[PDB]
Design a protein around this ligand. Structure first.
Ligand SMILES: CSC[C@H]1O[C@@H](n2cnc3c(N)ncnc32)[C@H](O)[C@@H]1O
Ligand SMILES: CSC[C@H]1O[C@@H](n2cnc3c(N)ncnc32)[C@H](O)[C@@H]1O
Ligand SMILES: [Cl-]
Ligand SMILES: [Cl-]
Lengths: 226, 226
């Protein structure tokens, strides 16, 4: 566990249960009944709940757990992941963190992933024994303190521009590099922490594209048989 | 349109409406009513319809349109895609092909993607004018004939092993390389066509991982500013 590994954090992620402010908003009471589930237990999904986000703070960019799903499928199925060179974390917009054991097999299917997140939020850890997924209250800085990396990079379209190849080379110079990607569809980080801002392209990309650029460029430096 | 572009085909994809053999299987009649939609119009989804696949031919690996969703999000949001160096196609297990205009913005959300596929299957082309998506009856060989590539690679765990970096270099030697990835969760291709079998790793990976390895390795050779 002192070999070189990438520590990847999907941060300020739009992954949360229905906000308390809107639990009795019409579109929420009817979704909830239709699914025969208590509205507070349900994961906010902007696709279904769009008419209830209008007056919510930051409503336009909330309830996007699809971003997390696709980022996690990309990361957990990576060659980098199978070679024991990745640790991945989710930090949510409400300052909770989800820890993920490397061997975790996320549902490929979005609605099963949703099901699984509802369980994780309810019980704090899934499954009961393994705690392959484990959630707790935590800020981004508190998480970074635990990881105790030797460098922190923050992926930002407006940071120092790098060729992805070259960013992979750069990450391979550290022992315990941490890379942070926003889990939100647009705008800026909410959680300002210390680190180097890196752009991989001079237009905005989606989080999972960035996850891929970083993971694949790092594989080719760090996996010795490559 | 005679610059170097990758032509990527997700093939024998498990993307189809409910099979005629099971349209009046219980789990299908009740799903269908619950959604107030005619069962033949609905996309087969093994997550919901698992009890109806038991006796279907190949039932175990059918109704996996999530694989296509995640492969297409990876491909269409790629840097390679934004640089006009990618054309992507879906070939389904029933010998239909979906053509995709580069500028297409797939729903990030799985259930909207499903919605969109139901429309595409019904009308043959979406939206009415743009035909950003367009479907028609076609075998894999018929599709390859149209593309008229100068080389065809078939991604196979048991093919000639290559370092992804090196496979990118290889693809960059051709004008119009075609790469084929299976859109099925396990097993072999159904559609045997002529081409070079390439493994990128000596264990089985998921289609979207392979899509990423290929697309990212090609970007770094073919985009000159990289
Ligand atoms: C708002 S898009 C989601 C996240 O993707 C990352 N991102 C988006 N575009 C780029 C880019 N061009 N370079 C680097 N990171 C990016 C950032 O970490 C952002 O929070
Ligand atoms: C059955 S997994 C889906 C598809 O992924 C591709 N694939 C899976 N594992 C590998 C691998 N190790 N190397 C190359 N292609 C692979 C093949 O094209 C397959 O049809
Ligand atoms: Cl090492
Ligand atoms: Cl060119």
């Amino acid at each position: 566990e002192e070999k070189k590994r990438l520590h990847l954090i999907i941060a300020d992620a739009e992954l949360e249960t229905v906000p308390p402010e809107i639990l009795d908003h019409p579109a929420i009471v009817n979704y909830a009944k239709r699914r025969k589930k208590r509205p507070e237990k349900i994961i906010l999904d902007s696709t279904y709940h769009h008419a209830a986000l209008r007056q919510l703070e930051d409503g336009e960019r909330r309830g996007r757990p699809d971003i997390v799903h696709i980022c996690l499928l990309n990361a957990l199925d990576s060659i980098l992941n199978k070679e024991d060179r990745l640790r991945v974390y989710v930090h949510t917009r409400n300052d909770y963190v989800i820890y993920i054991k490397p061997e975790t097999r996320l549902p490929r299917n979005y609605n099963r992933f949703i099901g699984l997140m509802e369980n994780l939020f309810e019980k704090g850890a899934v499954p009961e024994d393994l705690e392959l997924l484990r959630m707790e209250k935590k800020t981004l800085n508190e998480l970074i303190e635990e990881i105790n990396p030797d460098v922190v990079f923050i992926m930002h379209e407006e940071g120092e521009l790098m060729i992805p190849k070259n960013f992979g080379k750069l990450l391979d110079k550290f022992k315990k590099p941490t890379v942070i990607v926003g889990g939100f569809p647009h705008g800026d980080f909410k959680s300002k922490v210390d680190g180097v801002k890196i752009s991989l392209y001079r237009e905005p990309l989606m989080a999972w594209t960035i996850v891929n650029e970083v993971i694949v460029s790092y594989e080719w430096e760090v996996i010795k048989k490559f």
